[PDB]
Amino acid sequence: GTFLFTSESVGEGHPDKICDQISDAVLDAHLQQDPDAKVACETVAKTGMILLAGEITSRAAVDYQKVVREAVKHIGYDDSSKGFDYKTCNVLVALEQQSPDIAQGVHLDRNEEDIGAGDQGLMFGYATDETEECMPLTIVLAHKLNAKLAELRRNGTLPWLRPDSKTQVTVQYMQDRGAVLPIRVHTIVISVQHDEEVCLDEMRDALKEKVIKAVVPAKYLDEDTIYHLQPSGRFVIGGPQGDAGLTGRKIIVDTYGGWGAHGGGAFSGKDYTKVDRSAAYAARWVAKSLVKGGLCRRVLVQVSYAIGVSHPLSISIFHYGTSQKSERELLEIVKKNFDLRPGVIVRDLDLKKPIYQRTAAYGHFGRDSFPWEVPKKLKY
Amino acid sequence: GTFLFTSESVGEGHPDKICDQISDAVLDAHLQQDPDAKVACETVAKTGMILLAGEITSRAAVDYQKVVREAVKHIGYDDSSKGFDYKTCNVLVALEQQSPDIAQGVHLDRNEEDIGAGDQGLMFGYATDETEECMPLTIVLAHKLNAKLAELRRNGTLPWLRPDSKTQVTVQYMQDRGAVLPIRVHTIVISVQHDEEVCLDEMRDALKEKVIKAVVPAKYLDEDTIYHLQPSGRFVIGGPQGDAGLTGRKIIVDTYGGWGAHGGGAFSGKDYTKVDRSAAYAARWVAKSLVKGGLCRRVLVQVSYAIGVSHPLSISIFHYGTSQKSERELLEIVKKNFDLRPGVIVRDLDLKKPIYQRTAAYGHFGRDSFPWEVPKKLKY
Ligand SMILES: C[S@@+](CC[C@H](N)C(=O)[O-])C[C@H]1O[C@@H](n2cnc3c(N)ncnc32)[C@H](O)[C@@H]1O
Numbered sequence A, B: 001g002t003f004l005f006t007s008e009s010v011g012e013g014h015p016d017k018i019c020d021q022i023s024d025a026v027l028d029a030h031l032q033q034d035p036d037a038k039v040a041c042e043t044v045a046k047t048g049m050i051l052l053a054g055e056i057t058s059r060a061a062v063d064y065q066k067v068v069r070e071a072v073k074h075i076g077y078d079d080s081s082k083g084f085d086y087k088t089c090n091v092l093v094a095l096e097q098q099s100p101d102i103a104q105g106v107h108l109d110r111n112e113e114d115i116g117a118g119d120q121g122l123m124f125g126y127a128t129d130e131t132e133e134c135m136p137l138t139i140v141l142a143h144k145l146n147a148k149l150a151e152l153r154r155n156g157t158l159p160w161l162r163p164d165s166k167t168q169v170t171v172q173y174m175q176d177r178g179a180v181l182p183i184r185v186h187t188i189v190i191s192v193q194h195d196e197e198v199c200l201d202e203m204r205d206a207l208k209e210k211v212i213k214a215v216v217p218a219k220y221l222d223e224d225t226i227y228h229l230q231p232s233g234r235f236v237i238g239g240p241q242g243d244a245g246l247t248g249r250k251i252i253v254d255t256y257g258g259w260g261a262h263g264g265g266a267f268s269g270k271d272y273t274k275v276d277r278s279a280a281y282a283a284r285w286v287a288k289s290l291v292k293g294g295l296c297r298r299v300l301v302q303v304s305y306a307i308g309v310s311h312p313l314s315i316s317i318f319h320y321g322t323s324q325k326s327e328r329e330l331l332e333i334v335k336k337n338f339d340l341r342p343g344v345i346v347r348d349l350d351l352k353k354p355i356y357q358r359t360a361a362y363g364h365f366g367r368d369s370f371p372w373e374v375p376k377k378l379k380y
């Protein structure tokens, strides 16, 4: 009845995550001046370079040099000794207006509630009662390990830490009538960029004592837990110098860590008309509402859209055997309580608010009581 | 007992797919001269630009201008009237050597069989008996609709077609003791870039009669099937001009269309030491072997790795209730028959061969009898 499951997370200075945070800093900069900005901002990061590529139609006057550099400063890349510096890096901009063919097919001359989906696609929402925040323990732990590294770097406890990090947690679970119960942590991996002065044994000791023990409850750790701490042996070169980063290359870290399902769409750098983001947020909101509402212990929701069409093409619900109600009954409850048109989701989840940079590291779900994390009281 | 499931696919000229094909053309160019090339090539595409960013350490002498332009020519972007031209686009190169810290931790001075995983991560393999190729019908149909568009464009039947396309198929399934049985096609979406001369009604008629009817068996289509053909109403601007493309932004199209599970890793532009590709291919090979071997009707395999470590950290198997054997029994069969170290997978699946550009459109699985699609005869 037991099984293993592994999830990973990355830190704020992982090059792909730098890109997601810059793309969302650009989106927020536009939304601060024009709540109806149409934004599709991709970011690429490599040694010394941030390139913005995409499409933006907006009435805002945005200083891209300032927005980009301020986001890199927040992450912690502020000196050539760290491999990247917000003060002196190259910021290249290849941004054009949104395609008029897309604009006419999606939102031009359309009533806001009846705007079409900004693209076709499929999206999933997932929730599990295994944690209070309704997220898998594997991904919650993996995110908290990266957050702890950033905390210890920023407070000066471990001054040899640099912003680029990755973590991975394998948990042994027990099956329980469709639901899952965490038993113990089987393996933890941590890799983090570091300075040239600190030795490997000092790093491994700190990662176990000051990071793992500060995040993972002792009840999950035992004599058999496997630790792979700094397994490469050396990680001085890091950030964009060590590996090219792109927006939307950490979509499983952004969501459920492999649990549930994913439709493929990236979140960062997109306004609400892009259903890859808004409909995934709404699907998480529906899933969490079904679990917090006591209708299921674990649930998966799929929705799909066609470009230019407001209503979803399909809606499906899988309760893993954890509900007394059938899928048909749960779908009827969802139809009575939710309107999954993008032009209505924007109002329910306040998606013109410039809070997106906050979502772009540590996962979009299970944190900080964002609107999609506040369950809706269901009427049925 | 019935439910809906939707998957999507994209064409060869979808901007993200252009990037995956260019990244894999670069990898193949290196492997043709140096089978041990270390390649991590990301591609970005926007109006008039192909940018290569990443890390390559190789003994090959590669003409990036020629490799990139030949890949774009193959896709069909050969004139400014189409929005992109291989002859006149800008090709920018930001490629550096692989980080020496990664090289020392992964493969330097290591016996090939004992090379470490090129990164940490989680990967899944999936197989389903619903089609002979062991793939979900939703994604098989979605890929075939894009392939039909490219065929009709290349043979001159529909000369108004351009290379950028997207498709989406929703199938109504019946549950069958853990396995799934397709009943009918509920909805199809097709969007394809076109010239300025053809009218919307001519395109919609051709998409139904020459594309859908030529791909989807009539037994799946009925009076209630919903068609969204050219739903945006106009798609003249397309390819990188209409939307920025990046490598590794179609990872669900590349795999199972939402079925099974995904660990987040992209495939294109990476050599075998990057377990995001090799271990996902090996996991598909294990899953397909378990289904074709008669041990299950549907199966999901998860594997995970740590950078620098050769053996997987975890292996898990979920048979959806379609096997008489337990997960423990299936894991023992997998341990007896497979060695999932990257340095052994490379030999079993011939992963130094330059066939990667062929994998970069229409899915990596369920096609063309690649080594990971030829089931292993299991001994137990
Ligand atoms: C190992 S790199 C990816 C492979 C790389 N593109 C190559 O050229 O081999 C992927 C991520 O691992 C982390 N990383 C980079 N250098 C590392 C090192 N020396 N040891 C461990 N992890 C490292 C960074 O977070 C980086 O974004």
Ligand SMILES: C[S@@+](CC[C@H](N)C(=O)[O-])C[C@H]1O[C@@H](n2cnc3c(N)ncnc32)[C@H](O)[C@@H]1O
Residues within 6 Å of the ligand: A039, A040, A055, A056, A098, A099, A101, A102, A105, A118, A119, A307, B014, B015, B016, B164, B165, B166, B191, B192, B232, B233, B234, B235, B236, B237, B238, B239, B242, B243, B244
């Ligand atoms: C709709 S675009 C993505 C949104 C876009 N970045 C924006 O600025 O709104 C995504 C994909 O849809 C397709 N596409 C582009 N223009 C389109 C159009 N006019 N109608 C339908 N699909 C289109 C292309 O395959 C493109 O890569």
Ligand SMILES: COc1ccc(-c2c3c(C4CC4)nnc-3ccn2O)cc1
Residues within 6 Å of the ligand: A003, A004, A005, A175, A258, A259, A260, A261, B260, B261, B300, B301, B302, B316, B317, B318, B327
């Ligand atoms: C996509 O989300 C999932 C999540 C979990 C499971 C799963 C198992 C697995 C997965 C390969 C890791 N292995 N043993 C399992 C036993 C039960 N359950 O539920 C299946 C799918």
Ligand SMILES: COc1ccc(-c2c3c(C4CC4)nnc-3ccn2O)cc1
Residues within 6 Å of the ligand: A260, A261, A300, A301, A302, A316, A317, A318, A327, B003, B004, B005, B175, B258, B259, B260, B261
């Ligand atoms: C990730 O792969 C999957 C695939 C399919 C299912 C699934 C259902 C769904 C999903 C939301 C679409 N809806 N009704 C369902 C009934 C049965 N089964 O099996 C669950 C998970």
